Amino acid sequence: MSDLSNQRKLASKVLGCGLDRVWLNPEASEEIASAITREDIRGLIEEGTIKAKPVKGVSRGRARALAAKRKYGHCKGHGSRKGKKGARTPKKEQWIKKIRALRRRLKELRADGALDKSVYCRLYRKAKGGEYRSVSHLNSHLESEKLLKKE
Amino acid sequence: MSHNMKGQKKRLAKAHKQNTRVPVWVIVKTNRKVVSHPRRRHWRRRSLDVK
Amino acid sequence: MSKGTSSMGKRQKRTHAKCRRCGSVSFNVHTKQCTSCGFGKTSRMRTYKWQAKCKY
RNA sequence: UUAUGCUAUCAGGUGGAUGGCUCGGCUCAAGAGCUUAUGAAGGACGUGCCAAGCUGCGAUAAGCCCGGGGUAGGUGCAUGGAGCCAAUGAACCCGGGAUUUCCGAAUGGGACCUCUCCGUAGUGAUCAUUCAUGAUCGGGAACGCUCCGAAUUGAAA
RNA sequence: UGGAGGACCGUAAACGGUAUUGAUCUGCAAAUCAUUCGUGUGACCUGCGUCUCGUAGUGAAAUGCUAAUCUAACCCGGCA
RNA sequence: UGUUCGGGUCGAAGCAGGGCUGUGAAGUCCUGUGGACCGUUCACAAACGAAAAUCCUGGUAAUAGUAGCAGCAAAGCAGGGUGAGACUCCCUGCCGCCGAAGGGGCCAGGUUUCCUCGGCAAUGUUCGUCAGCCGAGGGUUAGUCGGUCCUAAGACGUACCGUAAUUCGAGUACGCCGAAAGGGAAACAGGUUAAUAUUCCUGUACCAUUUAGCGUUUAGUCUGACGUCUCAGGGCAAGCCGAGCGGCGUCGUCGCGCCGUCUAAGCAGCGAACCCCGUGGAGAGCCGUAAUGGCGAGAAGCGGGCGAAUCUGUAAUGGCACAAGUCGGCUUCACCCCGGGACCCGUGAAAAGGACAGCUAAAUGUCCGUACCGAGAACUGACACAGGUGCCCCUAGCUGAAAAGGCUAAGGCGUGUCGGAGUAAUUCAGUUAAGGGAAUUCGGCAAAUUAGCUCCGUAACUUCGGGAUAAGGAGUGCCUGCUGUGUAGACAGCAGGUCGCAGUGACCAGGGGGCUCUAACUGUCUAAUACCAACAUAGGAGAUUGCAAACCCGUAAGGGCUAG
RNA sequence: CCCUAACUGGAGUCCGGUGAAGCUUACAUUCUAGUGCACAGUCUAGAGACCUCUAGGGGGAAGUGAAGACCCCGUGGAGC
RNA sequence: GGAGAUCGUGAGCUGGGUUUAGACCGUCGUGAGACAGGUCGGUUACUAUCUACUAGAGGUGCCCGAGGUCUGCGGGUAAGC
RNA sequence: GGUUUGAUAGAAACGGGAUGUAAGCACCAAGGCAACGAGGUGUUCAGUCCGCGUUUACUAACCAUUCGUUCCUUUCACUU
Ligand SMILES: [Mg+2]
Ligand SMILES: [Mg+2]
Ligand SMILES: [Mg+2]
Ligand SMILES: [Mg+2]
Ligand SMILES: [Mg+2]
Ligand SMILES: [Mg+2]
Ligand SMILES: [Mg+2]
Ligand SMILES: [Mg+2]
Ligand SMILES: [Mg+2]
Ligand SMILES: [Mg+2]
Ligand SMILES: [Mg+2]
Ligand SMILES: [Mg+2]
Ligand SMILES: [Mg+2]
Ligand SMILES: [Mg+2]
Ligand SMILES: [Zn+2]
C-alpha cells in the first residue's frame, strides 16, 4: 500500500460523493494503486473495489410521535410556551379569518333567499362593528330575533 | 479574479518565465562563477510591481 | 479601526498605474499624469534642477 | 586521574585582517562637437539547439547585402555537449545599404486598457505661398541669451 | 378594527468601545483577546466610483484627522 | 619623488614566537610558515602614527541548551502498509471538531500557488518517506458567460481669453471618456479530462448585421424608468406526511429507521387583479374591503375586450446497481407576479436600446478574460500573524418566538502544526462551601441574587403622552378522554389520574426601591491613557442686503452662494 | 470579609526535539563600623567563609529600559 | 505608648490625593491665558547575570575498609503571655 | 521496606462500607369498541460499585551487571 490520496480524490469526483464517503477496500490496495485514470476508476467501481458509504440521516420517528400527541391537543401546557402571545398567533390573522367566515355566511344567507336587503345591510355593518364572535353566535341571534325569512 | 487585459497578462507571463534556475551547462562552462541571477523570487513574498 | 495594523487590511486598491512612456509605476489614475516623467501633463520630459546638488 | 576552574604556550575549527597583484576610478591637458515627421532619445515585448540575467538585434530578430583591409580558423560576457559555417576567402575591422513589432514629439479616434475602434489605407495643432508644396513640435554632460525671484546666515539681538 | 414613532427589548448580523483599572506587555497584535456593556427603521451602517490638501483642506470643535508623522504633512534643494 | 649604493626562487613582503641593542619612539637577527618582490646615502613631499567620540562597518561571546513552541477551537487510539529510518505519510474500524460557519458561490487582490512524476541541504515553531518547499513536464477552446455598447457624479482634449511666461488659470463652444454590483438581443440538459467547460462532443434551440427575393409605416406615443413604510391575493424552490416498489442497517425482544422512486431550455395552449366598452336604473339607502371606501358627474347585476407569474402537453430519450422508475396530500419563506393604503418645509437619475411591418433563403458573428485561492496557510499588516478586506451573497432535522443557545445531517477537518510522564510550591480560568451577612474597601470593585410565558394587581409625580415589565402575588411536568374558533395549517380551554427535594427541571433568560446635583431628549467626540456636565440640536433674539445687492475666492480672465 | 479549605482544566516542576533576545571596564563567597564629592562587595580595622549543583520568592547591586517631561540657563525655536 | 529603618517596604500590591493633555463654577486680565480655590474624567514596563536568604542533593578534606550507637564545640527559642 | 528460606504489589472469594430496591416477567391502573396506558405492587434491604481489611503463592519480585584492582607494563609479588 502506498499514498492513495490521489485515487481518493478521483473516486470522489467520479462518484460525486464527499471525500470521506468513499470506501477504498483495504485488501485491494495493490490493484487500486494502479488506477490513475477515470476509466480505470469506473472499472474499479463496477468490479466493487470502490463504493460510497451510505449517508446517515437524522431520524425523525420520536418527533413524529410527539407531533401526533400535540396534534391531539396534549404536551402544550403553560410550561411549554416560551414566546409571547401574538408571536404564536398574530391578531390580524384571527380577525381576518373571523370576518371572512362571517361575511361568507351572511352572503350565502342572502344568496339562497332567506334574508332581505335591509336586514342584510344592518347585519353586515353590525358584524363589521364586532358584535358577533363566531358563526354559531350569529346563527343564534338570527334564529332568536327572527330576522331570517325561513318558512 | 483580476480580469486582465492583453498587456498585463503579457507582462505576467514574462515575470513567470524569469523564475528559472540557471542552466547546469552554464555552471559547468563558467566554472562555478555564475550560480544565480537577481530575478529569482517567490510568489508568497514581496509582490511584483509588474502590473 | 486603529491607525496601525488594523486599518492596513483595506489596502486593496491602487493609486498609481504603469506609465507608457517610461515604464515606471508612477501614473496617477485620478489626475492622469505620470509623477516621474510628466507623461500626460506635457510633451516634454519632467526635469528639475533640485534633483541634484548645486554643482559647486 | 582534584571535580567545576585560573594563567601561559602549542595543534585544529570559525573568520576574513595584513601583504603582493589589479582590463576599475579620479584629476589635468590636446582635440572634436549637434540630432529628430525619410519618425529621434527612452521604454515594453520578443529573439539562441540545449539560454535564467546582462549585451546585441527586430517576425530577414547575438542577425542579411556590397566595396576595401586580413588570413586560417569561427560560433558575445562565459574554453560544456552535439552540430553547423569557412579557400565560392569566413571570423574580425573601416565605409555604404536593407529589414526595422508596439508605445513614445506620437500625429485618424480612445487609454487605473503599451493595446484597442472605424477602417472612409487616415495632411494631429499652429502657420507661409504661386495654393504644386514647405516650416515648427522632442532630445542633448555642462557652456549661452532673455524674463520672474527667497530664507537660513553676518551685523555676536 | 388600524399600524404611527430621530418609540421599546434584543443576536459575537452590523456599528461602537463603558468596567474588569482582568490576560498579554522582547505580545497573536508597533493597540489585540475574554467576560461585562451602548445603538440596532434611522441626524442609521456599508461596497464601488468621484471631488476637496499644506499658512491649505476637512472637522456635531478634541488643536481632532490629512498613508504607524500634525500648535503647520511628506520628498529633494538652500545645506558641509 | 629626485639621487647614490645594493638584496631576492641557494627563497622577498607579510604572519606567530623568541635573542640583542637603544632612556624611548623603534631597529636588527634567529626559528616555523610563505612563494615574489624589497631596501639604503643625501634631500623633498603628504589622502602620514588611535584606546576612548550612547564613534562607523564586519566578525563573534556571555546570557544559554535558557525563554518560547499553553490561555480564544484541551484529539486521538488499534490493526495493516510503504520506507535505510514512522507520535507526525497512506488504507480500514472506533472516538472527536464546525454545522445560519471552520460548508457552498464569487468581487478586489494574488499571479502558476493548479495537475502528474522525482527529491528532502534550506522553508514548515518538533520529526517527516509529507508539503502552498526544491527540479522536470503538462494544463485555461465562447455569436448566447462577462468586458466591449449607453449614460450618472465627474474627468480629459482642441479652440477662444488671461499670465512676464508655461507643463499654469475659471468660464464658453465643440468633442471625448467615466459602472466586471446602474440600463442591457440571444442556450439548455447530459457526457468527456489528471488538471477546461452554459466554451469541447450528442441532442434539441435561439438572436442579430449584410446580400437576394416578396410587401409596407401610425412617426408620434409607449417602454427602458425608478423613494420609505405597511398589507391582501396567486404561484413556486426548499420542507413534511400517507400508500406501493427496490436497496442498506438493526435483530437480547420488537419491527422499525434511512436512501431512491428522476427529466432542462425551446415550442403550443389557458389566464387572476387592475383597466376599457354595451346595457342596467339604486336612496326615509344600497354595494363592498384585512383596511381606507363607491354611488344619478350613474351603484348592484348582466355581457364583451386587452391582460402574469405559474400550470398542461411535447422536447422523450438522456442519465439510474437497463434496481425500482407509480401516486396522492399539507405547508411555503428569505424568491416571482399583481393590487391597495399611508408619509414627506425630503418628491425619490439619465441615455443607448426595444414596440408599433415584416416573411423566405444562404452567408457572416472579429477582439480580450477563462487554471487555482478568495482566507485561523494562496489578499493586506516584514511572517504558514487570534487583526482587517468578505458575513459580500446563500444554507437541512429536533427543542424553541427565532438565522438565539444546545444536540445531529450533507460538506470540510483531527494542521486555530511539538510530544512523553502524572509529583511539589506558585500562577491563568472555573465548581462548591458550616455560622455570620458589607463588619472588607477611597467606593458593594469583583462575584452572587432575579430571569420565559399566562392571570391578578400596580404608587408619588406628570408637559396628561407617561411613569410601567412599577412595586407585589399565584400557576407551569407527564398520562387518559375531550370541547370551542377556523376552509386549513394551527390556536385556545377543560375533566380525571400520577411522579419527583425540585416541572421556563439542562440551554437561554431584568435584582428592585427612595432622596439629591447636572444636561431637556435621540445624536457627536481626543484612531493608541479622557464616551463626560463638553459639541450638536429643536426653540428664542439680534444684524446686513431689493439682486449690476450683502458676504467671499482670483494677479487677471472670471467665479462660490445661485437652476437661489 | 471574620479565615480560609477541598477539587477541576491550562502552565510551572521532570524527560525527548527545536531554539532566541536584552543590562556586560575588570575581578567578585560576604557582614559590621569608619573614611571618602557627606548613600563602599573592591579603601581602613575587625568578623566570617570547604567547592559544585537544583528549586523558590524578589531584600541589595543607589538592578535594566531612556542624553528628565519638574526648576533654571541659551542676546536657541514654534504657535497664539 | 511614642518613634527609627532612603519620612522601612510600587523588578510586592493599591491608585483614593497631588502633578500632563478635556470641560464647568468663582475671582483676576482688554485678550491669549492664570489661581497658590473648588468639582467630574484620566495606560502602572522587565524571561534574575552577581550577591543574600529559605530548603533539597553530589563531591573533596579528616580517616586502616564498612556499619551501628553516642558525645556535644556551637546555633535557636516567648513557647508560653 | 521486600525479594521464594516470601504476604511486597495485583487477581479470586469473604468481612466492612456507598446508594436506594436493577432489567425482564406476572397482576392492577384513570380511561379507551379497540390498540395503547403515565404509574403502582411482587420477584427484591434488590442491582451496581469500593484509590479499605482477611485468607490464599493463583501471576509478577526472575535474569543479571557494577564498586570494594590507577591501567598497561612483566613501570609488576604477580601467574603460562
Ligand atoms: Mg496618522
Ligand atoms: Mg547649478
Ligand atoms: Mg545676527
Ligand atoms: Mg437595543
Ligand atoms: Mg534639508
Ligand atoms: Mg580600534
Ligand atoms: Mg455541534
Ligand atoms: Mg525541520
Ligand atoms: Mg464607455
Ligand atoms: Mg507540554
Ligand atoms: Mg445629554
Ligand atoms: Mg453647549
Ligand atoms: Mg546672555
Ligand atoms: Mg522594592
Ligand atoms: Zn512616465
Coordinates of N, CA, C and O (backbone and C1' of nucleotides) in Angstrom, one line a residue, chain B residues 5-8 10-11 14 17-18 20 22-23 25-26 28-30 37 39, chain D residues 44-47 50-54 76-80 112-116:
Chain B
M5 N -6.2 42.6 -19.0 CA -6.1 42.9 -20.5 C -5.0 42.1 -21.1 O -4.4 41.2 -20.4
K6 N -4.7 42.3 -22.3 CA -3.7 41.6 -23.0 C -2.3 41.9 -22.5 O -1.5 41.0 -22.3
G7 N -2.0 43.2 -22.3 CA -0.7 43.6 -21.9 C -0.3 43.2 -20.5 O 0.8 42.8 -20.2
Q8 N -1.3 43.3 -19.6 CA -1.0 42.8 -18.2 C -0.7 41.4 -18.2 O 0.3 40.9 -17.5
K10 N 0.6 39.7 -20.6 CA 1.8 39.5 -21.3 C 3.0 39.7 -20.3 O 3.9 38.9 -20.2
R11 N 2.9 40.8 -19.5 CA 4.0 41.1 -18.5 C 4.0 40.0 -17.4 O 5.1 39.7 -16.9
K14 N 5.9 37.1 -18.8 CA 7.3 37.3 -18.7 C 7.9 37.1 -17.3 O 8.9 36.4 -17.1
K17 N 8.3 33.6 -16.6 CA 9.4 32.9 -17.2 C 10.7 33.2 -16.6 O 11.7 32.4 -16.8
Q18 N 10.8 34.4 -15.9 CA 12.1 34.7 -15.3 C 12.5 33.9 -14.1 O 13.7 33.8 -13.7
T20 N 13.7 31.0 -13.2 CA 14.3 29.7 -13.6 C 15.6 29.6 -13.0 O 16.4 30.5 -12.8
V22 N 19.5 28.7 -13.0 CA 20.4 28.9 -14.1 C 20.8 27.5 -14.7 O 21.0 26.5 -13.9
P23 N 20.9 27.4 -16.0 CA 21.2 26.1 -16.6 C 22.5 25.4 -16.1 O 23.4 26.1 -15.7
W25 N 24.6 23.6 -17.7 CA 25.8 23.7 -18.5 C 26.4 25.1 -18.4 O 27.6 25.3 -18.7
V26 N 25.6 26.1 -18.0 CA 26.2 27.4 -17.8 C 27.2 27.3 -16.6 O 28.3 27.9 -16.6
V28 N 28.7 24.7 -15.6 CA 29.9 23.9 -16.0 C 30.8 24.8 -16.8 O 32.0 24.7 -16.7
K29 N 30.3 25.6 -17.7 CA 31.2 26.4 -18.6 C 31.8 27.5 -17.9 O 33.0 27.8 -18.2
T30 N 31.1 28.2 -17.0 CA 31.8 29.3 -16.4 C 32.6 28.9 -15.1 O 33.1 29.8 -14.5
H37 N 20.9 34.5 -10.5 CA 20.6 35.8 -11.1 C 19.7 36.6 -10.2 O 19.1 36.0 -9.3
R39 N 16.8 37.8 -10.6 CA 15.4 37.8 -11.0 C 14.6 36.7 -10.3 O 13.5 36.5 -10.6
Chain D
rA44 P 11.5 48.5 -19.8 O5' 10.2 47.9 -20.6 C5' 8.9 47.9 -20.0 C4' 7.8 47.4 -21.0 C3' 8.0 46.0 -21.4 O3' 7.4 45.1 -20.5 C1' 7.5 47.4 -23.3
rC45 P 8.1 43.6 -20.3 O5' 7.9 42.9 -21.8 C5' 6.7 42.2 -22.1 C4' 6.6 41.9 -23.5 C3' 7.5 40.8 -24.1 O3' 7.2 39.5 -23.8 C1' 7.5 42.7 -25.6
rG46 P 8.3 38.4 -23.7 O5' 8.8 38.2 -25.1 C5' 8.0 37.5 -26.1 C4' 8.6 37.7 -27.5 C3' 9.8 36.9 -27.9 O3' 9.5 35.6 -28.3 C1' 10.1 39.2 -28.5
rU47 P 10.6 34.4 -28.4 O5' 11.8 35.1 -29.2 C5' 11.9 34.9 -30.6 C4' 13.2 35.3 -31.1 C3' 14.4 34.5 -30.5 O3' 14.5 33.2 -31.2 C1' 14.9 36.8 -30.5
rC50 P 17.1 26.2 -27.4 O5' 17.8 25.3 -26.3 C5' 17.2 24.2 -25.7 C4' 18.1 23.3 -25.0 C3' 18.8 23.8 -23.7 O3' 17.9 23.8 -22.6 C1' 20.4 22.8 -25.1
rA51 P 18.3 24.5 -21.2 O5' 17.6 26.0 -21.4 C5' 18.1 26.9 -22.3 C4' 18.3 28.3 -21.7 C3' 17.3 29.3 -22.1 O3' 17.0 30.2 -21.0 C1' 19.5 30.0 -22.7
rA52 P 15.5 30.6 -20.7 O5' 15.7 31.8 -19.7 C5' 14.8 32.0 -18.6 C4' 15.5 32.6 -17.4 C3' 16.2 33.9 -17.6 O3' 15.4 35.0 -17.6 C1' 17.6 32.4 -16.5
rG53 P 15.7 36.3 -18.5 O5' 17.0 37.0 -17.8 C5' 16.9 37.5 -16.4 C4' 18.2 38.0 -16.0 C3' 18.8 39.1 -16.9 O3' 18.3 40.4 -16.6 C1' 20.5 37.5 -16.3
rC54 P 18.1 41.4 -17.8 O5' 19.6 41.8 -18.2 C5' 20.4 42.7 -17.5 C4' 21.8 42.7 -17.9 C3' 22.1 43.3 -19.2 O3' 22.2 44.7 -19.3 C1' 23.3 41.2 -19.0
rG76 P 29.8 32.7 -28.8 O5' 29.8 34.3 -28.5 C5' 31.0 35.1 -28.8 C4' 30.9 36.4 -28.1 C3' 31.0 36.4 -26.6 O3' 32.4 36.4 -26.2 C1' 29.2 37.8 -27.2
rC77 P 32.8 35.6 -24.8 O5' 32.3 36.5 -23.6 C5' 32.9 37.8 -23.3 C4' 32.3 38.4 -22.0 C3' 32.3 37.4 -20.8 O3' 33.5 37.5 -20.1 C1' 30.2 38.4 -21.1
rA78 P 33.9 36.3 -19.1 O5' 33.7 35.0 -20.0 C5' 34.1 33.7 -19.4 C4' 33.4 32.6 -20.1 C3' 33.1 32.8 -21.6 O3' 33.1 31.6 -22.3 C1' 31.0 32.6 -20.4
rU79 P 34.4 31.2 -23.1 O5' 35.4 30.6 -22.0 C5' 35.1 29.3 -21.4 C4' 35.5 28.1 -22.2 C3' 35.9 26.9 -21.5 O3' 34.9 26.1 -20.9 C1' 37.4 27.3 -23.3
rG80 P 35.2 24.9 -19.9 O5' 34.1 23.9 -20.2 C5' 33.9 23.2 -21.4 C4' 32.8 22.3 -21.4 C3' 32.4 21.6 -22.7 O3' 33.2 20.5 -23.1 C1' 30.4 22.5 -21.7
rC112 P -7.2 55.6 -18.3 O5' -6.7 54.4 -17.4 C5' -5.6 54.6 -16.5 C4' -5.5 53.5 -15.4 C3' -6.3 52.2 -15.7 O3' -5.6 51.3 -16.6 C1' -6.4 52.9 -13.4
rC113 P -6.0 49.8 -16.8 O5' -4.8 49.1 -17.5 C5' -4.4 49.6 -18.8 C4' -4.9 48.8 -19.9 C3' -4.4 49.1 -21.3 O3' -4.3 48.0 -22.1 C1' -6.8 49.4 -21.2
rU114 P -3.0 47.1 -22.1 O5' -1.9 47.9 -23.0 C5' -0.8 47.3 -23.5 C4' 0.0 48.2 -24.4 C3' 1.2 47.6 -25.0 O3' 0.9 46.9 -26.3 C1' 1.8 49.7 -24.1
rC115 P 1.2 45.3 -26.5 O5' -0.2 44.7 -26.4 C5' -1.2 44.9 -27.4 C4' -2.5 45.5 -26.8 C3' -3.7 45.6 -27.7 O3' -4.4 44.4 -27.8 C1' -3.4 47.6 -26.5
rU116 P -5.4 44.2 -29.1 O5' -6.4 45.4 -29.0 C5' -7.6 45.3 -28.3 C4' -8.4 46.5 -28.4 C3' -9.1 46.9 -29.7 O3' -10.4 46.2 -29.8 C1' -8.0 48.8 -28.9

